[PDB]
Structures are given as structure tokens and as C-alpha cells.
Write an enzyme that holds these catalytic residues in place. Sequence first.
Site, PDB file in Angstrom:
ATOM      1  N   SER A 146      -4.601  33.985  35.257  1.00 54.81           N
ATOM      2  CA  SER A 146      -4.026  32.836  34.569  1.00 54.81           C
ATOM      3  C   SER A 146      -4.937  32.209  33.526  1.00 54.81           C
ATOM      4  O   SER A 146      -5.357  32.874  32.564  1.00 54.81           O
ATOM      5  CB  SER A 146      -3.613  31.868  35.673  1.00 54.81           C
ATOM      6  OG  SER A 146      -2.572  30.984  35.257  1.00 54.81           O
ATOM      7  N   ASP A 201       6.699  37.767  34.904  1.00 57.74           N
ATOM      8  CA  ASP A 201       5.884  36.542  35.037  1.00 57.74           C
ATOM      9  C   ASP A 201       5.915  35.668  33.792  1.00 57.74           C
ATOM     10  O   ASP A 201       5.689  36.076  32.617  1.00 57.74           O
ATOM     11  CB  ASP A 201       4.427  36.994  35.174  1.00 57.74           C
ATOM     12  CG  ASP A 201       3.376  35.911  35.292  1.00 57.74           C
ATOM     13  OD1 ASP A 201       3.677  34.697  35.283  1.00 57.74           O
ATOM     14  OD2 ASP A 201       2.193  36.311  35.456  1.00 57.74           O
ATOM     15  N   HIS A 258       3.920  35.261  38.973  1.00 56.63           N
ATOM     16  CA  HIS A 258       2.493  35.018  38.752  1.00 56.63           C
ATOM     17  C   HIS A 258       1.559  35.099  39.954  1.00 56.63           C
ATOM     18  O   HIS A 258       0.367  35.224  39.639  1.00 56.63           O
ATOM     19  CB  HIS A 258       2.427  33.636  38.074  1.00 56.63           C
ATOM     20  CG  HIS A 258       1.157  33.313  37.350  1.00 56.63           C
ATOM     21  ND1 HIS A 258       0.559  34.086  36.365  1.00 56.63           N
ATOM     22  CD2 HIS A 258       0.371  32.217  37.511  1.00 56.63           C
ATOM     23  CE1 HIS A 258      -0.528  33.464  35.939  1.00 56.63           C
ATOM     24  NE2 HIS A 258      -0.669  32.332  36.621  1.00 56.63           N
TER      25      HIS A 258
END
EC number: 3.1.1.3
Length: 269
Positions: A146, A201, A258
Site C-alpha cells: 500500500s 484491488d 487489498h
Amino acid sequence: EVSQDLFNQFNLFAQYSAAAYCGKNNDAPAGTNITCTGNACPEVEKADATFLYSFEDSGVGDVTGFLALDNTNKLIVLSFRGSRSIENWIGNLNFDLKEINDICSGCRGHDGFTSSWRSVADTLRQKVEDAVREHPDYRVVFTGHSLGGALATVAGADLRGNGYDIDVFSYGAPRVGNRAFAEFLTVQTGGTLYRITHTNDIVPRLPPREFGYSHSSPEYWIKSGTLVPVTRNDIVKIEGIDATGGNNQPNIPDIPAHLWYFGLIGTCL
């Protein structure tokens, strides 16, 4: 459509990334064994991996993660944690494209990620470099999930060319700048960027293309789903700056997607 060794690095750096979220990993004294609750990083544990420098709340917008020593694999691993704090989340929202000619002429990057990195550059580079000096045969790798992958990508782009190679592995990472930086990131020498994405995602789709952002090439798109163990056939290498055949598609996006990069990531306490 990737080899078994590549796959195995992908999973190893994914587990390193996952390990940047466990709180105990951000304030551990130097020399200790990196460990993770909930089977978050078995390979990491298996390798006998020690911390060179564990950090919490560094620079601007909360830089968290660690710098590890992995003797089994011969690695100097620098790992950034993704979003977890109020500051972290808020740093994401500073999305204007700042100029970053110091890294690459004409390129522009996310103001908050260009910033955080810049905030911690000198110290982390120093530390990367003393380990490099002490173990000249170890492979330097920067990684993160991320926001932590965006931190990784920028820091790699910055510190290459200082005399040793830097590989980067980011997982579900946000776009980081404009087409000129995305371009820079595709051809830069002295390290390879491995940009791994998971199905639909949402995070690798932000900020959007409507905002002027672009993605570097290529993309390693994992196609198997959430909570389904991945295999070497599950990953397809998608070629081209702003390709649309991987995660950058016009469909409904997904959030849970994610948290699953080969195993749970972003869930370590």
C-alpha cells in the site's frame, strides 16, 4: 506466467511487507529476531532475520517500518508499512503533483509520499549504506504494501546510482506520480522495480488517471482471488505504461482484495 524463483521472491518480499505492520516490529532494538503474530511472516522467521534499525513515526506523515539483516538470503531489507494512523491516511490526501527534478528531470510525484520520503532520506540512506559497507555481497531490497509500496518506490528511485543496486517490490501500491516519473521508473538502471497487484484491488487505481497520475511498466498481476493461495501461473506480467489489462480497468474495484497478497497483509497487530 512467472517462474518459481520469482514467485518465491514475491511471497518473501510480501511477507517482509506484511511484517512492517506488527507494532512490535517498529520499536525493536537492533540485533533482535523479526517475528510476526498470526503466521504473518514464516519465511522471515525461518531466515533468522534481525533488525538493523526499527522505526516508528519518522519524518513527516508517519514513516514506520524497519531495516533488517537477512543472512540466510543475503539481503539488506528496508520495509515500509502502509496506512494505519490518522496521519498516514491524511498524508494520502495530499495528492497534488509536486516537481521532483532532483530524482528525474520533468517528473512529478504525490506531494505526501514525495514528502515523507524526503523527510527521512538522509538517515535511512546512511543506514542502508552502513550495512552495504559491512556486507557488500548482500542484495539491497526496498519494499512495502500500500502506502509502504509507494514509500518504497520513491526511495528506490531516489537512492539508485549511489553505487549498489536496489530492487523494489511494492504490493497493491498506489500510483506515485506523473507519466514522466512512470517513464523514469520503467527504464531506470541499477535495480528492478517489481510492481505486484491483486485482481481488482482498489488502491493501485488511486489517485486516478483523471488526476494526471500514471503507472510505471511493467505490472505483475495476481489473478487468483482473496483468500485463495496463489501459484506461479496465477501471475501474468502486463506490459506498458498505463496498460489496461491488469488492475487498471474500468470495473467496480474491491477493498478486501487489498489485504490478500499471497497471504494476509495489513492485518498484523
